[PDB]
């Protein structure tokens, strides 16, 4: 009596969670902008009214894809230039003691060594300035990486400047954005929208501080896969950036040594003028206000009448124990002791100066046996960055304890991309559907 | 109309709307379903999109619904697949909820559809034989 | 090319007629001068300016036609 028959509907607005390969869109660099699709000057956003979708930032395939793409790009950029195999030799070093500050005693070592000449049967006695973190004693010293693996010199004309990257899916796939403010990184999002692809995400590398990122809209945002678990990192997104001014003022001089046929090694010859430590300045009042907002948002998940103390990093590698980043080619490791040192209880032009150490031998990712040597940057170097986020780790403690201690953390770069891709998921369209109708062919 | 703006309906705009209302916006979905490390993966992205579109077009064709948005078919709807009424589904349910409901009956429906299309082709051949 | 033909309803047809009228300003030549006195290359060169607008006209005409067909089949 009903006379119900199948009717095929094409273009049905239905999607499904899926994983696909997202290409690059954007406007010599490690990140290949020349080999990317040109972005639409007028991005086309759509509000998915009457829609609710469940998001989970901590299991997003986009983060893993971005990590893999960045690692592949870094591997690609380091291939077509010299590998410093012959650099591993005994180094006769002396302490640099001319025009130095009391805080830079022993940091720089003036090391003389023999080096291979363009001719295979000749040697040249050369000298170079090496940071103390790069040399280990056997007066005799050797590069730290020698007993681990050979180091590949960074291509000199290749720039390390982050460039925004748009991860855009193929046709038949869309990206869902959660525009709901006060979002928690896991669960339903009442305010969902669909996009062709995302905004410009700069692949900024940083530990203990998220630099040049995206800021929150309403207030400081606390995110964690499991806040009750002390083994899960806490990601904090600021609403207002904090200006940080980093500088190495040594007037470094770069010299080229012919280490073979068509192979050049770039060494730090001498520093013009006084030698003093690199550092980073952070506004004291702005940082205090930011930490006040952070503690206000953190007390919501740990109690209102609980002491919240910010302390130093527990320990480990130099990458995680200090704020490690790259600025203008140089690799800074800053002792963030004056920042995370305070306690909070429920109730001027000066700034905090963090000393920083420069390193040339770089173990960029969490890998053993793949090290990089950064050629020195000529002249004074200074740059300014926007602290827009934070990575924290909660100390173990116990339930009986009435205080919660949070220390800076990082190391894993998956969190850095997660902080930018938290409001994004990928879905595949399913335009074919079958419904019952009283129609007959 | 002199003073009037243009509200262009968007892609997947009627996802949360009821099936009856969402069936009126099939075009905005169907019209744009095809359109060193970066280039190599762009290539396979293009290939994936092309093959997905071609498989969808083949599935449409083998059911006799090629080049159509709404295609009335001759196979009856078995009540065991869904006991819900027409007014229930077409006014109190979205397309996504319907897909979740009948996710485990799609293959049988597709097989019946293609079998019926083959039978219709055979019947047309027999009719043309006279 | 196949989808461009399909969005006009000309799927699988080498020669497909359409309801779009031929506006005079596109070409003032008669049928005899077009189909018996010049080739296709000269034609394409002539109507290169009016190609996208014609394509949009055919596209919207086919859209209207399918909407009307759906409305008629609804009853």
């Amino acid at each position: 009596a009903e006379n119900l028959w199948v009717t095929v509907y094409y273009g049905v607005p239905v999607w499904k969670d899926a994983e696909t390969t997202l290409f690059c869109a954007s406007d010599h660099n490690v990140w290949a902008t020349h080999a990317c699709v040109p972005t639409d000057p007028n991005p086309q956003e759509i509000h998915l009214e009457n829609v609710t979708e469940e998001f989970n930032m901590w299991k997003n395939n986009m983060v893993e894809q971005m990590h893999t793409d960045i690692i592949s790009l870094w591997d690609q950029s380091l291939k077509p230039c010299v590998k410093l195999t012959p650099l591993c030799v005994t180094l006769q070093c002396t302490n640099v003691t001319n025009n130095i500050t009391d805080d830079m005693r022993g940091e720089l070592k003036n090391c003389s060594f023999n080096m291979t000449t363009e001719l295979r049967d000749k040697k040249q006695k050369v000298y170079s300035l090496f940071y103390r973190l790069d040399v280990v004693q056997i007066k005799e010293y050797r590069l730290i990486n020698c007993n681990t693996s050979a180091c590949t010199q960074a291509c000199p004309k290749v720039s390390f400047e982050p460039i925004p990257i748009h991860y855009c899916a193929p046709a038949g796939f869309a990206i869902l954005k959660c525009k709901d403010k006060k979002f928690n990184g896991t669960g339903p999002c009442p305010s969902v929208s669909t996009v062709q692809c995302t905004h410009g995400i700069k692949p900024v590398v940083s530990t203990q501080l998220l630099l040049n990122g995206s800021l929150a809209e309403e207030e400081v945002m606390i995110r964690s896969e499991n806040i009750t678990n002390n083994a899960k990192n806490i990601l904090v997104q600021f609403n207002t950036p904090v200006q940080i001014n980093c500088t190495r003022p040594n007037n470094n001089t770069r010299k080229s040594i012919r280490i073979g046929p068509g192979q050049a090694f770039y060494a730090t010859g001498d520093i013009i003028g006084d030698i003093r430590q690199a550092h980073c300045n952070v506004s004291k009042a702005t940082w205090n206000e930011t930490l006040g907002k952070v503690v206000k948002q953190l007390r919501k998940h740990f109690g209102n009448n609980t002491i919240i103390r910010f302390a130093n990093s527990s320990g480990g590698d130099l990458e995680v124990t200090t704020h490690s980043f790259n600025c203008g080619g140089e690799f800074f490791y800053c002792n963030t002791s004056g920042l995370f040192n305070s306690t909070w209880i429920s109730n001027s032009n000066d700034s905090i100066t963090l000393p920083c150490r420069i390193k040339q031998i770089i173990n960029m990712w969490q890998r053993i046996g793949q090290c990089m040597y950064a050629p020195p940057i000529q002249g004074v170097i200074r740059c300014v960055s926007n602290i827009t986020g934070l990575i924290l780790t909660r100390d173990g403690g116990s339930t009986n304890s009435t205080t919660e201690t949070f220390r800076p953390g990082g190391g894993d770069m998956r969190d850095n991309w997660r902080s930018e891709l938290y409001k994004y998921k990928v879905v595949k369209i399913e335009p074919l559907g079958v419904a019952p109708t009283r129609c007959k062919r | 109309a002199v003073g009037i703006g243009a509200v262009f309906l968007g892609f997947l705009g009627a996802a949360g709307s009821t099936m009856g209302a969402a069936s009126m916006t099939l075009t905005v979905q169907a019209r744009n379903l095809l359109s060193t490390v970066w280039g190599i993966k762009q290539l396979q992205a293009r290939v994936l999109a092309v093959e997905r579109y071609l498989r969808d077009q083949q599935l449409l064709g083998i059911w006799g619904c090629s080049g159509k948005l709404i295609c009335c078919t001759n196979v009856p709807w078995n009540s065991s697949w869904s006991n819900r009424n027409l007014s229930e589904i077409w006014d109190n349910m979205t397309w996504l909820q319907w897909d979740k409901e009948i996710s485990n009956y799609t293959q049988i429906i597709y097989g019946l559809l293609e079998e019926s299309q083959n039978q219709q082709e055979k019947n047309e051949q027999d009719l043309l034989a006279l | 090319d196949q989808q461009l033909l399909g969005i006009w309803g000309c799927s699988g047809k080498l020669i497909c007629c359409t309801n779009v009228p031929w506006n005079s300003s596109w070409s003032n030549r008669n049928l005899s001068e077009i189909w018996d006195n010049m080739t296709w290359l000269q034609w394409d060169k002539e109507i290169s300016n009016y190609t996208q607008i014609i394509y949009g006209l055919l596209e919207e005409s086919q859209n209207q036609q399918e909407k009307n067909e759906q409305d008629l089949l609804a009853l």
Partner: antibody
Framework: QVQLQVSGPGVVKASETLSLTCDVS??????????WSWVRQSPGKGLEWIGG????????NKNPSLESRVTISKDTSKNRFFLRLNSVTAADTAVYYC????????????????????WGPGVLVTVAT | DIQMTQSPSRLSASVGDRVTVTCRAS??????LSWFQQKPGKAPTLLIF???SLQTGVPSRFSGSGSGTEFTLTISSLQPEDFATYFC?????????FGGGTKVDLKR
């Protein structure tokens, strides 16, 4: 669905500038353009169109009678629009409504045959002395 | 400016009666004129656009006809909620000229 809310001073002195602000809360983010217009109704009289402006372009259109006295501005970033009337007289005491007009399309050219033509709750403006 | 004249200025009808209103322009404006309804102390709500198309959510009892200079609004079955002022607005060319309003009151 788009929602309109208007605001402004309920009493304006004669020969002053009457400023009304109407804010819009919608768009579905699809980069539409609406037409934001103002219409007044005097007590015991019919509706009269003051003017309007597009939501994306600076093209603003005015009543020839009120061309010299009306100025319409907009803020698309904050999603609002403002009407300013100069040389207000006793005849301008009226209920002011702010409106958004739009046309529904499937694509650029594929008109679907629908509009919204929404009107705000309105506010009474009295020209006292 | 294009002048709109609406008739009858006022009318009385009971529930279930048929009501007709005529809106006439000063020149040909094609089918570009919308019919609008406004309740006391409320904003106007769209009833009909392009003189023949019913807005979404409007009861089907409302209808519109005519073209050129003369257009007509018809209510087949008057209801208690329909007692509101109706007006006719042109949009063929600037300026947008409204109708004179059509107040309808309950019969007694």
């Amino acid at each position: 669905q788009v929602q309109l809310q208007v605001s402004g001073p309920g009493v304006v002195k004669a020969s002053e500038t009457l400023s009304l602000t109407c804010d819009v809360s919608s768009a579905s983010n699809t980069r539409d353009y609406f037409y934001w217009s103002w219409v007044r109704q005097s007590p015991g009289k019919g509706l009269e169109w003051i003017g309007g402006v597009y939501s994306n372009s600076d093209t603003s259109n005015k009543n020839p009678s009120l061309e010299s006295r009306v100025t319409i501005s907009k803020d698309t970033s904050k999603n609002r629009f403002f009407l300013r009337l100069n040389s207000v007289t006793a005849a301008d005491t009226a209920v002011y409504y702010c409106s958004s007009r739009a046309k529904i399309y499937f694509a650029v050219g594929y008109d679907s045959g629908g509009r919204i033509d929404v009107w705000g709750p309105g506010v009474l403006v009295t020209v006292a002395t | 400016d294009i002048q709109m004249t609406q008739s009858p200025s006022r009318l009385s009808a009971s529930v279930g009666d048929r009501v007709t209103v005529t809106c006439r322009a000063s020149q040909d404006i094609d089918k570009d004129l919308s019919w609008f309804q406004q309740k006391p102390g409320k904003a106007p709500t769209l009833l009909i656009f392009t003189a023949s198309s019913l807005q979404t959510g409007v009861p089907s009892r409302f209808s519109g006809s005519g073209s050129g200079t003369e257009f007509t609004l018809t209510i087949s079955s008057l209801q208690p909620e329909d007692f509101a002022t109706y007006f006719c607005q042109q949009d063929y060319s600037f300026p947008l000229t409204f109708g004179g309003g059509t107040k309808v009151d309950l019969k007694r």
